[PDB]
Amino acid sequence: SMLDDAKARLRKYDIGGKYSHLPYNKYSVLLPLVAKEGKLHLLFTVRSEKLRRAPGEVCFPGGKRDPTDMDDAATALREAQEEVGLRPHQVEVVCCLVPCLIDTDTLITPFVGLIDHNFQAQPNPAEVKDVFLVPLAYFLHPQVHDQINHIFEYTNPEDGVTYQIKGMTANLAVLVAFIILEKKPT
Numbered sequence: 446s447m448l449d450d451a452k453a454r455l456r457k458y459d460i461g462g463k464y465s466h467l468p469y470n471k472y473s474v475l476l477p478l479v480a481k482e483g484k485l486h487l488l489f490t491v492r493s494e495k496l497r498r499a500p501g502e503v504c505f506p507g508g509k510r511d512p513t514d515m516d517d518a519a520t521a522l523r524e525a526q527e528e529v530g531l532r533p534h535q536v537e538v539v540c541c542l543v544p545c546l547i548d549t550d551t552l553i554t555p556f557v558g559l560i561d562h563n564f565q566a567q568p569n570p571a572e573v574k575d576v577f578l579v580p581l582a583y584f585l586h587p588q589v590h591d592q593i594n595h596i597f598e599y600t601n602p603e604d605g606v607t608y609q610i611k612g613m614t615a616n617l618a619v620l621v622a623f624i625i626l627e628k629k630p631t
């Protein structure tokens with residue numbers, strides 16, 4: 446099946462806990478995969494303009510590890526619940542992808558999660574201004590704008606609204622699309 450095929454592909458890239466004990470300032474993100482209309486999509490947030498890190502930017506759900514978290518996956522899940530209402534029974538964490546090093550002292554660990562078909566986002570306005578889906582296949586043929594560095598523009602066909610996706614977020618989206626969609630029969 447589509448979903449069993451996705452998980453099987455993702456598991457080949459799982460690094461597990463190999464980099465998780467190193468002495469960094471630690472953040473996690475959740476890359477949430479949603480199946481709609483026979484195709485895979487990624488779920489993105491627009492961050493509230495009020496926040497410390499990355500105000501008004503497109504990002505994946507996530508945040509800083511706290512002492513309550515059992516591990517790095519727990520950080521991702523706690524933050525996704527606070528931002529968009531995703532509950533534990535509504536997500537299966539499939540793997541941990543390569544971490545992202547920034548600012549000399551910070552390590553961001555990305556987890557890929559399969560999202561239940563009855564989940565409906567409830568944006569928390571203190572953290573998130575918007576929540577939106579993008580088909581995973583978009584990231585194979587994106588609409589690129591040079592700002593010099595590369596930005597993606599995605600227009601939602603439901604309503605005509607355009608979103609800009611860039612930086613670590615754009616990079617991780619391309620990675621997941623390559624892992625799941627490369628070399629597939631039609």
Ligand SMILES: CC(C)(C)C1CCN(C(=O)c2ccccc2)CC1
Nearest residue numbers: 472473474498499504507508548551
């Ligand atoms: C979505 C999530 C909250 C996980 C990101 C963490 C990293 N970000 C920073 O801006 C950053 C940069 C240097 C040090 C600390 C944070 C962007 C946002």
